[model samples]
Each structure stands twice: as structure tokens, then as C-alpha cells.
Target: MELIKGQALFLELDKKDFLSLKNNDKNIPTFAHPKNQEKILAIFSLPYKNPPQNTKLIAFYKDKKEEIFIKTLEGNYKSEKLQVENKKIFPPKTIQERIAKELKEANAIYSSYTPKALFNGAFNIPLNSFITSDFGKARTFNEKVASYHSGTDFRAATGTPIYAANSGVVKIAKDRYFAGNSVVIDHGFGIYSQYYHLSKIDVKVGQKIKKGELIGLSGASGRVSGPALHFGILAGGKQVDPLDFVSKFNAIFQL
Candidate 1:
């Protein structure tokens, strides 16, 4: 029930309760202990390559497990295991500026919502090329290995056209400190799609996009070796492997 700062823990709960909470319409907010400050923990429904062995679900609770909803997942799930040391909390001024910018863009996108847009559609690979990275590959950053890879990376040319996998409203269209030129589309409910390291963005912040519509062009904009598309799918804020929902999943193309 209580979450400790900078700790990673695996949670478990009944499947029905987990599904119900996940399908809720409003954001389920939580407080961070004695401070009572609002915190956002996005829940996601993820499927794995295998069950129980390749994936495991664990739960953490402060009291009797029956009272609290469980947090579940796959793959070496642990509770309060990953610890953060020597981290810098962004200053209030910086946080304010960032939130303001996000709100400004999100408001515009929400205002332009349309009902005819399709939510779930097959996503075509942005380029006819090779796969440089695989989803779920253990990533190393600055010599430290990451927990898990959250997206699929495809090698592409600098000007390769990137299209929307499904119809959705442009939720985020901005240059991020880590993602570089990024585009996030809300594919209805809490399922979202993201494209990172774009060379150029073709759509506006609040545009209603359709499946296969051009959203941006591929480029080596972020911390990468060459031009590529960092494609990601998110449900309830947690990143999931994109290949789970895409049709005809393939790593390479002979173009």
C-alpha cells in the first residue's frame, strides 16, 4: 500500500481486481506517505512471451494483503529492490515551467478531439530496413545496465516517413530532454503510442491523426548511434512492448 521513494517492488493481486482498476476512466491518484503529496502511478496491462517462468507477478502491501489491490507484472518482479542514489530532484521553478508547457500543449490537443478516429489499427514499420534493437533487450546506459527495454528500435534513414500506427489525438509534441523530438498519441482510453528521435514533426500539437497518417520523419535526434525510430506503446502510463499489438511482427525488411 505504501510506496517508498526510489524503490522498485513487484505487486500481486487478483486478476479481476487488477483488470477493473485498470479499466477505470479517471486517474487513480495516490499519496506519498506522510507528506500527503499527490503522486501519479500509471498502471498497465502487459502480456509477456511466456508465463510464470519468463514472467512473474509479485505484490507489496503494508497490511493484510486482502485489503489492498495488488500490483502485478511479468519478468523478475521485485519489491523495493531497485534503489536510486544521488538523484537530483528538479527545482520547483523548473518543474513549474515543464508542467506549464505540457499543459499548454495537452489542452490544445484535447480541444481538437474527434469521434470518427479509429483507436486500434495495425502499425506498419516506418522504414523498409533492418532492426537495430529488439524489444526487451537489456539496455546499458553509461555502463550501467537498465532494468528492461521498453520499446522497439528500427533502423531508418534520416528522412524516412513515420506514420501513426492507429488513429488518436496528438497528446505530446515537444522536444524532451531524454527523448529528443518526440510524438505521443492517445489511442483512446489509456492506450498510447509514442515516436521518438524524429528528424522532423509533420503534425501539430492538437491535430486529429488517422491510421497510417504521416506524423514525423525518422532521424538520429536523441542519444543514438544513427537514424532510427524508437517506437513505444504505453497503457496507463507504463511502457509495454509494441510488438504485442502490432500485426505481422518482423524485425527486418529487404528494402
Candidate 2:
């Protein structure tokens, strides 16, 4: 299948197979699990919001014989209105070095690819709940600039248990101006999961955890209106649909 810039696509693979994707003459980031030998997932996503040119996306496998073209898909999402909040929370404090510094450090973590596929199977939802909010939806806050929602928010009350989406090392398990008491896990193969707006962080930086392990508790922290769990999955540094990664079904075959 193909992908869209700023959005994520789902990929499924048979046992003992792996792939490396390329786009625009650059190596597109990937994470995968073979059917055999540890049996991992092969989910791919690119962290691009706007690509003026609809460039080619090439997929080549080490154990396979042919290269496939994974065409990117496009869509136009409608905009919504949201209540404006303190600029400090709505848009975050841009001038504050804390937020800027976090961006730099976090980007470094997100971009670094871990070769080994850490997940054993499909990705899991931390809250075991339906999403109250979705990704890629744009909204205007403070009746000002349109902001894109980058993560999925799960329906959870305060202190709801948040589990690990997959087995990986805890990358960024710290509080931030926008994410609140957040925990970011790196599941290797360029895949990552983020748990934001938590009331408590249960894991430590550099710690490794298995899929479904407790990592934090949900809350109305940071800039949220009520208690909820914001769950996110990123492949190649872009956010993909967590539901697609975790759900039991998908009609789209892997490229």
C-alpha cells in the first residue's frame, strides 16, 4: 500500500521477511517483525506533513527478490473549532528555552533508528479504550492559527492505567510544556510510542519494557480539559494511526 505525507499507513508482513523503504532519494524510516524468528511487526510511516511533489516511494526487501512501489495516498480533512486557552498552553511558550530544547532533544531521539525489531506482534493500545480524539484533525485555538492534532486521545478517567504499546526502551519519560508528564518509548526499527498528559510516570529513562507493561497513569495534565490518555505511534518519526497498528483486522495487504 501507499502513504500520505503527514499521515501514516499500515503494513503487514509474513514471517521471515523484512523491507527497507526509500522516498525522494532518501531512506524512508521503517520498523518490522518477520513471520518467523522472534516474529515482529513491519509497520512503516514517514514524518512528513507536506511534500509539494508526489515523489516515488520504493520498497526493497533483504530476503525478497523484487522492489515494490508503495504509492502515497492523499486526503483533505475538515477543520474544527476548539476552545481557546491560555497562550501558554494553547500554542505553548515558544520563547521559553525549555520547550525549544525539548524539541531538539526529542527529535534526536525520534529520528534515531534502532535496527532490531522490538515488538513481538501488532502494537497495543495503552489504555485499552476507544479514542476520544483523533490524529490529523486541525483546530483553531484562541481563534488564531490552525493547529494540527498529532496524537490520539483515549477515553480514560484520572489515574487510569497506561500500558506500554510495545517492547522497547523508554526514550523521553519526562514532563514538558506541551506533553505534560509524558513517556516516549522507542520500539526499535524506527518505531515509537508516546504517552502524554499523564498524571504519573511509572517508568524511567533508558528502561526497557515489554508490550502491555504499566508505564504511566492518565490525567488532565498539561493543557487538557478533562482526564484522557493521549496515545501516539510514530514510524520514521511521523505519527500513524494507533488503531490500525493495534486492531485485529486490516484489508490492505503489505507491499
Q: On residues 42-79, what C-alpha lDDT tens digit does candidate 1 reach at each position?
A: 23343332212222222223432233333334334222
Encode model 2's per-residue lDDT on 1-255: one tens digit a residue: 456655555444333444555665777554333324443344456443453434445556676633445555655644677775525454445646787898899889987888886664656568668867777676656544356677788898999999997788998888888889999988776778899999999999999899889998888789557889888877756677566544521232121
Candidate whose lDDT is highest: 2
lDDT, model 2, position 190: 74
Query: On a 0 to 100 scale, what is the lDDT of residue 247 in model 2?
Result: 54
What residue runs in model 2 are displaced by over 4 Å at the alpha carbon?
1-5, 10-21, 29-33, 36-48, 59-72, 76-78, 81-95, 140-145, 247-255
* Candidate 1 stretches greater than 4 Å from native: 1-117, 139-146, 247-255
Which residue pairs clash within candidate 1?
8-80, 9-79, 9-80, 10-58, 10-78, 11-58, 11-59, 11-71, 12-58, 12-59
> What TM-score, over all chains together, does every model reach?
0.55, 0.75
Clashes of each: 10, 7
